Amino acid sequence: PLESQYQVGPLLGSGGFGSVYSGIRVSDNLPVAIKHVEKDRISDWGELPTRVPMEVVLLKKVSSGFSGVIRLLDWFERPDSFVLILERPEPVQDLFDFITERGALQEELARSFFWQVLEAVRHCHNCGVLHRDIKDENILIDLNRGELKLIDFGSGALLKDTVYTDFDGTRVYSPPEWIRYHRYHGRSAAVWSLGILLYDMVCGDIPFEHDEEIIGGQVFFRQRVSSECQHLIRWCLALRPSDRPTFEEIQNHPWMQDVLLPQETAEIHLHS
Amino acid sequence: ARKRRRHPSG
Ligand SMILES: CN1CCC2(CC1)NC(=O)c1c(c3ccc(Cl)c(Cl)c3n1C)[C@H]2C#N
Ligand SMILES: [Cl-]
């Protein structure tokens, strides 16, 4: 019974998806996020060996001791919603607010964060899950441990090697082949979203707001960014999907070398 | 001066 096992606290956020609350598991005081998804807004459904939101299927597939992805601890069905119990880092800030408040991140910080996102996305792909909404809003920073967690699998799909013709993630992080043709492959589209994210980190906002900018193929840098970092970004943002790097190519890129450990990242950049 | 905004996932 849901209402017995968790103490609900303050609303943490809401939007199209539904609403999420701070909570604590009564059983042992573990911090949790309690996410309410309305059935009316669930577009994609999966099957547990039960009919659940695809989000629940994807979350279960990526569920593990690896911290890089949010863990689903439990879930419940109600008449008009599903309630998902997610583990909650404490203290936490999402990467959107962190960039808003701090501005453009030092490259050493951006490198540590971006590497950790790469590792988390690799984890998803290797678990057969495509996220489809990689953005700063969907990344939490454990501000004490300096560990990042990918959240929000509500636009995700099972990973496949053929084209996707559906998309409900964030348009400004979506690739030019989606804008032009309503078609993309999963991995190359993920790399584009990663390019947007890296630019966001080192410049303090995303490069593109408009469809014409997304398809235009020009990346103007508004901050001083190293040549090596600009190169990586522009490679991730190649207009031709097959010109974009693999995850291996990204992590082998010279700009990605000598990454900080998460605990060093907290010590140098987060503890204040 | 330039406005940074969240963007809706849909
Ligand atoms: C666009 N994304 C953002 C994450 C999303 C769902 C929508 N919204 C959040 O507000 C949010 C989410 C969170 C998930 C876990 C934890 Cl620990 C926290 Cl603090 C979360 N927050 C603040 C997401 C949901 N629901
Ligand atoms: Cl989430």
Coordinates of N, CA, C and O in Angstrom, one line a residue, chain A residues 2-177:
Chain A
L2 N 0.7 2.1 -1.1 CA 1.6 3.3 -1.3 C 1.6 4.3 -0.1 O 2.6 4.6 0.4
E3 N 0.4 4.7 0.3 CA 0.3 5.8 1.3 C 0.8 5.4 2.7 O 1.1 6.2 3.5
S4 N 0.9 4.1 2.9 CA 1.5 3.6 4.2 C 3.0 3.7 4.2 O 3.6 4.1 5.2
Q5 N 3.7 3.3 3.1 CA 5.2 3.1 3.1 C 6.0 4.4 2.9 O 7.2 4.4 3.3
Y6 N 5.4 5.5 2.4 CA 6.2 6.7 2.2 C 5.5 8.0 2.9 O 4.3 8.1 2.8
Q7 N 6.4 8.8 3.5 CA 6.0 10.1 4.0 C 6.3 11.1 2.9 O 7.4 11.3 2.4
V8 N 5.2 11.7 2.4 CA 5.3 12.7 1.3 C 5.7 14.0 1.9 O 5.2 14.4 2.9
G9 N 6.7 14.7 1.2 CA 7.0 16.0 1.5 C 6.7 16.9 0.4 O 5.7 16.7 -0.4
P10 N 7.4 18.0 0.2 CA 7.2 19.1 -0.8 C 7.2 18.6 -2.2 O 8.0 17.8 -2.6
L11 N 6.4 19.2 -3.0 CA 6.4 19.2 -4.5 C 7.8 19.6 -4.9 O 8.2 20.7 -4.6
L12 N 8.5 18.8 -5.7 CA 9.7 19.1 -6.3 C 9.6 19.7 -7.8 O 10.4 20.5 -8.2
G13 N 8.5 19.3 -8.5 CA 8.3 19.8 -9.8 C 7.1 19.2 -10.4 O 6.5 18.2 -9.9
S14 N 6.6 19.8 -11.5 CA 5.5 19.3 -12.3 C 5.6 19.9 -13.7 O 6.2 20.9 -14.0
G15 N 4.9 19.2 -14.6 CA 4.7 19.7 -16.0 C 3.8 18.7 -16.7 O 3.0 18.1 -16.2
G16 N 4.1 18.6 -18.0 CA 3.4 17.7 -18.9 C 3.3 16.3 -18.3 O 2.2 15.8 -18.3
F17 N 4.4 15.8 -17.9 CA 4.6 14.5 -17.4 C 3.7 14.1 -16.2 O 3.2 13.0 -16.1
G18 N 3.4 15.1 -15.4 CA 2.8 14.8 -14.1 C 3.5 15.7 -13.0 O 3.9 16.8 -13.2
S19 N 3.6 15.1 -11.8 CA 4.1 15.8 -10.6 C 5.0 15.0 -9.8 O 4.8 13.8 -9.7
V20 N 6.1 15.6 -9.2 CA 7.0 14.8 -8.4 C 7.2 15.5 -7.0 O 7.3 16.7 -7.0
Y21 N 7.2 14.7 -6.0 CA 7.3 15.1 -4.6 C 8.5 14.6 -3.9 O 9.0 13.5 -4.2
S22 N 9.1 15.3 -2.9 CA 10.1 14.8 -2.0 C 9.4 13.8 -1.2 O 8.2 14.0 -0.8
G23 N 10.0 12.7 -0.8 CA 9.5 11.8 0.1 C 10.5 11.0 0.9 O 11.7 11.1 0.6
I24 N 10.1 10.3 1.9 CA 11.0 9.5 2.7 C 10.4 8.1 2.8 O 9.1 8.1 3.0
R25 N 11.1 7.1 2.7 CA 10.6 5.7 3.0 C 10.6 5.6 4.5 O 11.6 5.7 5.2
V26 N 9.4 5.3 5.0 CA 9.1 5.2 6.4 C 10.0 4.0 7.0 O 10.6 4.2 8.1
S27 N 10.1 3.0 6.2 CA 10.8 1.7 6.6 C 12.2 2.0 7.1 O 12.7 1.4 8.0
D28 N 12.9 2.9 6.4 CA 14.3 3.2 6.8 C 14.8 4.7 6.6 O 16.0 4.9 6.6
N29 N 13.9 5.6 6.4 CA 14.2 7.0 6.1 C 14.9 7.3 4.8 O 15.5 8.4 4.7
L30 N 15.0 6.4 3.9 CA 15.7 6.6 2.7 C 15.0 7.7 1.9 O 13.8 7.7 1.7
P31 N 15.7 8.8 1.5 CA 15.1 9.8 0.6 C 14.7 9.2 -0.7 O 15.4 8.4 -1.3
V32 N 13.5 9.6 -1.2 CA 13.0 9.2 -2.4 C 12.3 10.3 -3.1 O 12.0 11.4 -2.5
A33 N 12.0 10.2 -4.4 CA 11.2 11.1 -5.2 C 9.9 10.2 -5.5 O 10.0 9.1 -5.9
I34 N 8.8 10.8 -5.3 CA 7.5 10.2 -5.6 C 6.9 10.9 -6.8 O 6.5 12.0 -6.8
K35 N 6.9 10.1 -8.0 CA 6.5 10.7 -9.3 C 5.2 10.1 -9.7 O 5.0 8.9 -9.9
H36 N 4.2 11.0 -9.9 CA 2.9 10.7 -10.3 C 2.7 11.0 -11.8 O 2.9 12.2 -12.2
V37 N 2.5 10.0 -12.5 CA 2.2 10.1 -14.0 C 0.7 9.7 -14.3 O 0.2 8.6 -14.0
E38 N 0.0 10.7 -14.9 CA -1.3 10.5 -15.3 C -1.5 9.6 -16.5 O -0.7 9.7 -17.4
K39 N -2.4 8.6 -16.4 CA -2.6 7.6 -17.4 C -3.0 8.3 -18.7 O -2.5 7.8 -19.8
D40 N -3.7 9.4 -18.7 CA -4.1 10.1 -19.9 C -3.0 10.7 -20.7 O -3.1 10.9 -21.9
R41 N -1.8 10.9 -20.0 CA -0.7 11.4 -20.8 C 0.4 10.3 -21.1 O 1.4 10.6 -21.8
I42 N 0.2 9.1 -20.6 CA 1.1 8.0 -21.0 C 0.7 7.6 -22.4 O -0.4 7.1 -22.7
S43 N 1.7 7.8 -23.3 CA 1.5 7.5 -24.8 C 2.0 6.1 -25.1 O 1.3 5.4 -25.9
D44 N 3.1 5.8 -24.5 CA 3.8 4.5 -24.8 C 3.7 3.5 -23.6 O 4.1 3.8 -22.5
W45 N 3.2 2.3 -23.9 CA 3.0 1.3 -22.9 C 3.8 0.1 -23.2 O 4.1 -0.2 -24.4
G46 N 4.3 -0.5 -22.1 CA 5.0 -1.8 -22.2 C 4.3 -2.9 -21.4 O 3.3 -2.7 -20.8
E47 N 5.0 -4.0 -21.4 CA 4.4 -5.2 -20.7 C 5.5 -5.9 -19.8 O 6.5 -6.3 -20.3
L48 N 5.2 -6.0 -18.5 CA 6.0 -6.7 -17.6 C 5.6 -8.2 -17.6 O 4.4 -8.5 -17.6
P49 N 6.6 -9.1 -17.6 CA 6.2 -10.6 -17.7 C 5.4 -11.0 -16.5 O 4.2 -11.2 -16.6
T50 N 1.9 -7.6 -16.9 CA 1.1 -6.4 -16.6 C 1.3 -5.3 -17.6 O 2.4 -5.2 -18.2
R51 N 0.3 -4.5 -17.8 CA 0.4 -3.3 -18.7 C 0.9 -2.1 -17.9 O 0.2 -1.6 -17.0
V52 N 2.1 -1.7 -18.2 CA 2.7 -0.5 -17.5 C 3.2 0.5 -18.5 O 3.3 0.2 -19.7
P53 N 3.4 1.8 -18.1 CA 4.1 2.8 -18.9 C 5.4 2.2 -19.4 O 6.1 1.6 -18.7
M54 N 5.7 2.6 -20.7 CA 7.1 2.2 -21.2 C 8.1 2.8 -20.2 O 9.1 2.1 -20.0
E55 N 7.9 3.9 -19.6 CA 8.9 4.5 -18.6 C 9.3 3.4 -17.6 O 10.4 3.3 -17.2
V56 N 8.3 2.7 -17.1 CA 8.5 1.7 -16.0 C 9.4 0.5 -16.5 O 10.3 0.1 -15.9
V57 N 9.1 0.1 -17.8 CA 9.9 -0.9 -18.4 C 11.3 -0.5 -18.6 O 12.2 -1.3 -18.3
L58 N 11.5 0.7 -19.1 CA 12.9 1.2 -19.4 C 13.7 1.4 -18.1 O 14.8 1.0 -18.0
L59 N 13.0 1.9 -17.0 CA 13.6 2.1 -15.7 C 14.0 0.8 -15.1 O 15.1 0.6 -14.5
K60 N 13.2 -0.2 -15.2 CA 13.5 -1.6 -14.7 C 14.7 -2.2 -15.5 O 15.6 -2.8 -14.9
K61 N 14.8 -1.9 -16.8 CA 15.9 -2.4 -17.6 C 17.2 -1.8 -17.2 O 18.3 -2.4 -17.2
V62 N 17.2 -0.5 -16.8 CA 18.5 0.2 -16.4 C 18.8 0.2 -14.8 O 19.8 0.7 -14.4
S63 N 17.8 -0.4 -14.1 CA 17.9 -0.5 -12.6 C 19.2 -1.3 -12.2 O 19.4 -2.4 -12.7
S64 N 20.0 -0.8 -11.3 CA 21.2 -1.5 -10.9 C 21.9 -0.7 -9.8 O 21.5 0.4 -9.4
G65 N 23.1 -1.2 -9.4 CA 23.9 -0.5 -8.4 C 24.8 0.6 -9.0 O 25.4 1.4 -8.2
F66 N 24.8 0.7 -10.3 CA 25.5 1.8 -11.0 C 24.7 3.1 -10.8 O 23.5 3.2 -11.2
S67 N 25.3 4.1 -10.2 CA 24.7 5.3 -9.7 C 24.4 6.2 -10.9 O 23.7 7.2 -10.6
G68 N 24.9 6.0 -12.1 CA 24.8 7.0 -13.1 C 23.4 7.3 -13.6 O 23.1 8.3 -14.3
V69 N 22.5 6.4 -13.4 CA 21.1 6.4 -13.7 C 20.2 6.3 -12.5 O 20.5 5.6 -11.6
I70 N 19.2 7.1 -12.4 CA 18.2 7.1 -11.4 C 17.7 5.6 -11.2 O 17.5 4.9 -12.2
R71 N 17.5 5.2 -10.0 CA 17.0 3.8 -9.7 C 15.5 3.9 -9.3 O 15.1 4.6 -8.4
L72 N 14.7 3.1 -10.0 CA 13.3 2.8 -9.6 C 13.3 1.9 -8.5 O 13.7 0.7 -8.6
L73 N 12.8 2.3 -7.3 CA 12.7 1.4 -6.1 C 11.4 0.7 -6.1 O 11.4 -0.5 -5.6
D74 N 10.4 1.3 -6.6 CA 9.0 0.6 -6.6 C 8.1 1.4 -7.5 O 8.4 2.5 -7.9
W75 N 6.9 0.8 -7.7 CA 5.9 1.5 -8.5 C 4.5 1.0 -8.1 O 4.4 -0.2 -7.7
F76 N 3.5 1.8 -8.4 CA 2.1 1.5 -8.0 C 1.2 1.9 -9.0 O 1.4 2.9 -9.7
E77 N 0.0 1.3 -9.1 CA -1.0 1.7 -10.1 C -2.2 2.3 -9.3 O -2.6 1.7 -8.3
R78 N -2.7 3.4 -9.7 CA -4.0 3.9 -9.2 C -5.0 4.0 -10.3 O -4.6 3.8 -11.5
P79 N -6.2 4.4 -10.0 CA -7.2 4.5 -11.0 C -6.8 5.3 -12.2 O -7.1 4.9 -13.4
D80 N -6.2 6.5 -12.0 CA -5.9 7.4 -13.1 C -4.5 7.7 -13.2 O -4.1 8.5 -14.1
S81 N -3.7 7.1 -12.4 CA -2.2 7.3 -12.5 C -1.4 6.1 -12.2 O -1.9 5.1 -11.7
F82 N -0.1 6.2 -12.5 CA 0.9 5.4 -11.9 C 1.8 6.3 -11.0 O 2.0 7.5 -11.3
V83 N 2.2 5.7 -9.9 CA 3.1 6.4 -9.0 C 4.5 5.6 -9.0 O 4.5 4.4 -8.8
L84 N 5.5 6.3 -9.3 CA 6.9 5.7 -9.4 C 7.7 6.3 -8.2 O 7.8 7.5 -8.0
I85 N 8.4 5.4 -7.5 CA 9.3 5.7 -6.4 C 10.7 5.6 -6.9 O 11.2 4.6 -7.3
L86 N 11.4 6.8 -6.8 CA 12.7 6.9 -7.3 C 13.7 7.2 -6.2 O 13.3 7.9 -5.2
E87 N 14.9 6.8 -6.3 CA 15.9 7.1 -5.2 C 16.2 8.6 -5.4 O 16.2 9.1 -6.5
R88 N 16.4 9.3 -4.3 CA 16.7 10.7 -4.4 C 18.1 11.0 -3.7 O 18.2 10.7 -2.5
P89 N 19.0 11.6 -4.5 CA 20.2 12.1 -3.9 C 19.9 13.3 -3.0 O 19.0 14.1 -3.2
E90 N 20.7 13.5 -1.9 CA 20.5 14.6 -1.0 C 21.9 15.0 -0.5 O 22.7 14.1 0.0
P91 N 22.3 16.2 -0.6 CA 21.7 17.3 -1.4 C 21.9 17.2 -2.9 O 22.9 16.6 -3.3
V92 N 21.0 17.7 -3.6 CA 20.9 17.6 -5.0 C 20.6 19.0 -5.7 O 19.9 19.8 -5.1
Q93 N 21.0 19.2 -6.9 CA 20.6 20.3 -7.8 C 20.6 19.7 -9.2 O 21.5 18.9 -9.6
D94 N 19.6 20.1 -10.0 CA 19.6 19.7 -11.4 C 20.6 20.5 -12.2 O 21.0 21.6 -11.8
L95 N 21.1 20.0 -13.3 CA 22.2 20.6 -14.1 C 21.7 21.9 -14.7 O 22.5 22.8 -14.9
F96 N 20.4 22.0 -15.0 CA 19.8 23.3 -15.5 C 20.0 24.4 -14.5 O 20.6 25.4 -14.9
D97 N 19.6 24.3 -13.3 CA 19.7 25.3 -12.3 C 21.2 25.6 -11.9 O 21.6 26.7 -11.7
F98 N 22.0 24.5 -11.9 CA 23.4 24.7 -11.6 C 24.0 25.6 -12.7 O 24.7 26.6 -12.3
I99 N 23.8 25.4 -14.0 CA 24.3 26.2 -15.1 C 23.7 27.6 -15.0 O 24.5 28.6 -15.1
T100 N 22.4 27.8 -14.8 CA 21.8 29.1 -14.7 C 22.5 29.9 -13.6 O 22.8 31.1 -13.8
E101 N 22.8 29.3 -12.4 CA 23.4 30.0 -11.3 C 24.8 30.2 -11.4 O 25.3 31.3 -11.0
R102 N 25.6 29.3 -12.0 CA 27.0 29.4 -12.1 C 27.5 30.0 -13.4 O 28.7 30.4 -13.5
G103 N 26.7 30.0 -14.4 CA 27.1 30.3 -15.7 C 27.9 29.2 -16.4 O 27.8 28.0 -16.0
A104 N 28.6 29.6 -17.4 CA 29.5 28.8 -18.2 C 30.5 28.1 -17.2 O 31.2 28.7 -16.4
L105 N 30.6 26.7 -17.4 CA 31.4 25.9 -16.5 C 32.8 25.9 -17.0 O 33.1 25.8 -18.2
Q106 N 33.8 26.0 -16.1 CA 35.2 25.6 -16.4 C 35.3 24.3 -17.1 O 34.5 23.3 -16.8
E107 N 36.1 24.2 -18.1 CA 36.3 23.0 -18.9 C 36.6 21.7 -18.1 O 36.1 20.6 -18.5
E108 N 37.3 21.9 -17.0 CA 37.6 20.8 -16.1 C 36.3 20.2 -15.5 O 36.2 19.0 -15.4
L109 N 35.4 21.1 -15.1 CA 34.1 20.7 -14.6 C 33.2 20.1 -15.6 O 32.7 19.1 -15.4
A110 N 33.1 20.8 -16.8 CA 32.4 20.3 -17.9 C 32.9 18.9 -18.3 O 32.1 18.1 -18.7
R111 N 34.2 18.7 -18.3 CA 34.8 17.4 -18.7 C 34.3 16.3 -17.8 O 33.9 15.2 -18.2
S112 N 34.4 16.5 -16.4 CA 34.0 15.6 -15.4 C 32.5 15.3 -15.6 O 32.1 14.1 -15.6
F113 N 31.7 16.3 -15.7 CA 30.2 16.1 -15.9 C 29.9 15.3 -17.2 O 29.1 14.4 -17.2
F114 N 30.5 15.7 -18.3 CA 30.2 15.2 -19.6 C 30.6 13.7 -19.7 O 29.9 12.9 -20.2
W115 N 31.7 13.4 -19.1 CA 32.2 12.0 -19.0 C 31.2 11.1 -18.3 O 31.0 10.0 -18.7
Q116 N 30.7 11.7 -17.1 CA 29.8 10.9 -16.3 C 28.4 10.7 -17.1 O 27.8 9.7 -16.9
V117 N 28.0 11.7 -17.9 CA 26.8 11.5 -18.7 C 27.0 10.5 -19.8 O 26.2 9.6 -20.0
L118 N 28.2 10.5 -20.4 CA 28.6 9.5 -21.4 C 28.5 8.1 -20.8 O 27.9 7.2 -21.3
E119 N 29.1 7.9 -19.6 CA 29.0 6.6 -18.9 C 27.6 6.1 -18.6 O 27.3 5.0 -18.8
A120 N 26.7 7.1 -18.2 CA 25.3 6.8 -17.9 C 24.5 6.4 -19.1 O 23.7 5.5 -19.1
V121 N 24.8 7.1 -20.2 CA 24.1 6.8 -21.5 C 24.6 5.5 -22.1 O 23.8 4.7 -22.6
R122 N 25.9 5.2 -22.0 CA 26.4 3.9 -22.4 C 25.7 2.8 -21.6 O 25.3 1.8 -22.1
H123 N 25.5 3.0 -20.3 CA 24.8 2.1 -19.4 C 23.4 1.8 -20.0 O 22.9 0.7 -20.0
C124 N 22.7 2.9 -20.3 CA 21.3 2.7 -20.9 C 21.3 1.9 -22.2 O 20.5 1.0 -22.3
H125 N 22.2 2.3 -23.1 CA 22.3 1.6 -24.4 C 22.7 0.1 -24.3 O 22.1 -0.7 -25.0
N126 N 23.6 -0.2 -23.3 CA 23.9 -1.5 -23.1 C 22.9 -2.3 -22.3 O 22.8 -3.5 -22.4
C127 N 22.0 -1.6 -21.7 CA 20.7 -2.3 -21.1 C 19.6 -2.3 -22.1 O 18.5 -2.7 -21.7
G128 N 19.8 -1.9 -23.3 CA 18.8 -1.9 -24.4 C 17.8 -0.7 -24.4 O 16.7 -0.8 -24.9
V129 N 18.2 0.4 -23.7 CA 17.3 1.5 -23.5 C 17.9 2.8 -24.2 O 19.1 3.1 -24.0
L130 N 17.1 3.4 -25.0 CA 17.4 4.7 -25.6 C 16.6 5.8 -24.8 O 15.4 5.7 -24.7
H131 N 17.3 6.8 -24.3 CA 16.7 7.8 -23.4 C 15.8 8.8 -24.2 O 14.7 9.1 -23.7
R132 N 16.3 9.4 -25.3 CA 15.6 10.4 -26.1 C 15.2 11.7 -25.5 O 14.6 12.5 -26.2
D133 N 15.8 12.0 -24.4 CA 15.6 13.4 -23.8 C 16.8 13.8 -22.9 O 16.6 14.4 -21.8
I134 N 18.0 13.6 -23.4 CA 19.2 14.0 -22.7 C 19.3 15.5 -22.8 O 19.2 16.1 -23.9
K135 N 19.3 16.1 -21.6 CA 19.4 17.6 -21.5 C 19.8 17.9 -20.0 O 19.5 17.0 -19.2
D136 N 20.3 19.1 -19.8 CA 20.6 19.5 -18.4 C 19.5 19.4 -17.4 O 19.7 19.0 -16.2
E137 N 18.2 19.7 -17.8 CA 17.0 19.5 -16.9 C 16.9 18.1 -16.4 O 16.2 17.9 -15.4
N138 N 17.4 17.1 -17.2 CA 17.2 15.7 -16.9 C 18.5 15.0 -16.3 O 18.7 13.8 -16.5
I139 N 19.3 15.8 -15.6 CA 20.5 15.4 -15.0 C 20.6 16.0 -13.6 O 20.5 17.3 -13.4
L140 N 20.7 15.2 -12.5 CA 20.9 15.6 -11.2 C 22.3 15.5 -10.8 O 23.0 14.6 -11.2
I141 N 22.8 16.5 -10.0 CA 24.1 16.5 -9.4 C 23.9 16.2 -7.9 O 23.3 16.9 -7.2
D142 N 24.5 15.0 -7.5 CA 24.8 14.8 -6.1 C 25.9 15.7 -5.6 O 27.1 15.5 -5.9
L143 N 25.5 16.8 -5.0 CA 26.4 17.9 -4.7 C 27.6 17.5 -3.7 O 28.6 18.2 -3.7
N144 N 27.3 16.5 -2.9 CA 28.3 16.0 -2.0 C 29.3 15.0 -2.5 O 30.5 15.0 -2.2
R145 N 28.8 14.1 -3.4 CA 29.6 13.0 -4.0 C 30.2 13.4 -5.4 O 31.1 12.7 -5.9
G146 N 29.7 14.5 -6.0 CA 30.0 15.0 -7.3 C 29.6 14.0 -8.3 O 30.3 13.9 -9.4
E147 N 28.6 13.2 -8.1 CA 28.1 12.2 -9.0 C 26.8 12.7 -9.7 O 25.9 13.2 -9.0
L148 N 26.7 12.5 -11.0 CA 25.6 12.9 -11.8 C 24.7 11.6 -12.1 O 25.2 10.5 -12.1
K149 N 23.4 11.9 -12.2 CA 22.3 10.9 -12.4 C 21.4 11.4 -13.5 O 20.8 12.4 -13.4
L150 N 21.3 10.5 -14.5 CA 20.4 10.7 -15.5 C 19.0 10.3 -15.1 O 18.8 9.2 -14.6
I151 N 18.0 11.2 -15.3 CA 16.7 11.0 -14.9 C 15.8 11.2 -16.1 O 16.2 11.5 -17.2
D152 N 14.5 11.0 -15.9 CA 13.4 11.3 -16.9 C 13.4 10.4 -18.1 O 13.8 10.8 -19.2
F153 N 13.0 9.1 -18.0 CA 12.8 8.2 -19.1 C 11.5 8.2 -19.8 O 11.1 7.2 -20.4
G154 N 10.7 9.3 -19.6 CA 9.4 9.4 -20.1 C 9.2 9.6 -21.6 O 8.1 9.5 -22.1
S155 N 10.3 9.8 -22.3 CA 10.3 10.0 -23.8 C 11.2 8.8 -24.4 O 11.4 8.9 -25.6
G156 N 11.6 7.9 -23.6 CA 12.5 6.8 -24.0 C 11.8 5.7 -24.9 O 10.6 5.7 -25.0
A157 N 12.7 4.8 -25.4 CA 12.2 3.7 -26.2 C 13.2 2.6 -25.9 O 14.4 2.8 -25.5
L158 N 12.8 1.4 -26.2 CA 13.7 0.3 -26.4 C 14.7 0.7 -27.5 O 14.3 1.3 -28.5
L159 N 16.0 0.4 -27.3 CA 17.0 0.7 -28.4 C 16.9 -0.3 -29.5 O 16.7 -1.5 -29.3
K160 N 16.9 0.1 -30.8 CA 16.9 -0.7 -32.0 C 17.8 -0.1 -33.0 O 18.3 1.1 -32.8
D161 N 18.1 -0.8 -34.1 CA 19.1 -0.4 -35.1 C 18.5 0.2 -36.3 O 19.2 0.6 -37.2
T162 N 17.2 0.3 -36.4 CA 16.4 0.8 -37.4 C 15.9 2.2 -37.0 O 16.2 2.7 -35.9
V163 N 15.2 2.9 -38.0 CA 14.9 4.3 -37.8 C 13.8 4.5 -36.8 O 12.8 3.7 -36.8
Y164 N 13.8 5.6 -36.0 CA 12.7 6.0 -35.3 C 12.0 7.1 -36.1 O 12.6 7.9 -36.8
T165 N 10.6 7.1 -36.1 CA 9.8 8.0 -36.9 C 8.9 8.8 -35.9 O 8.1 9.6 -36.3
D166 N 9.0 8.5 -34.6 CA 8.3 9.1 -33.5 C 9.3 9.8 -32.6 O 10.4 9.3 -32.5
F167 N 9.0 11.0 -32.0 CA 9.8 11.7 -31.0 C 9.0 12.6 -30.2 O 8.3 13.4 -30.7
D168 N 9.2 12.5 -28.9 CA 8.5 13.4 -27.9 C 9.4 14.0 -26.9 O 9.0 14.3 -25.8
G169 N 10.7 14.0 -27.2 CA 11.6 14.6 -26.3 C 11.7 16.1 -26.5 O 10.7 16.7 -27.0
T170 N 12.8 16.7 -26.2 CA 13.0 18.2 -26.3 C 13.5 18.6 -27.6 O 14.6 18.2 -28.0
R171 N 12.7 19.5 -28.3 CA 13.0 19.8 -29.7 C 14.4 20.5 -29.9 O 15.0 20.2 -30.9
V172 N 14.8 21.4 -29.0 CA 16.0 22.1 -29.1 C 17.3 21.2 -28.9 O 18.4 21.6 -29.2
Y173 N 17.0 20.0 -28.4 CA 18.1 19.0 -28.3 C 18.0 17.9 -29.4 O 18.7 17.0 -29.4
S174 N 17.0 18.0 -30.3 CA 16.7 17.1 -31.3 C 17.5 17.4 -32.6 O 17.9 18.5 -32.8
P175 N 17.8 16.3 -33.3 CA 18.7 16.5 -34.4 C 18.1 17.0 -35.7 O 16.9 16.9 -35.9
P176 N 18.9 17.5 -36.6 CA 18.5 18.1 -37.9 C 17.7 17.1 -38.8 O 16.8 17.6 -39.5
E177 N 18.0 15.8 -38.7 CA 17.3 14.8 -39.5 C 15.9 14.6 -39.0 O 15.0 14.3 -39.7

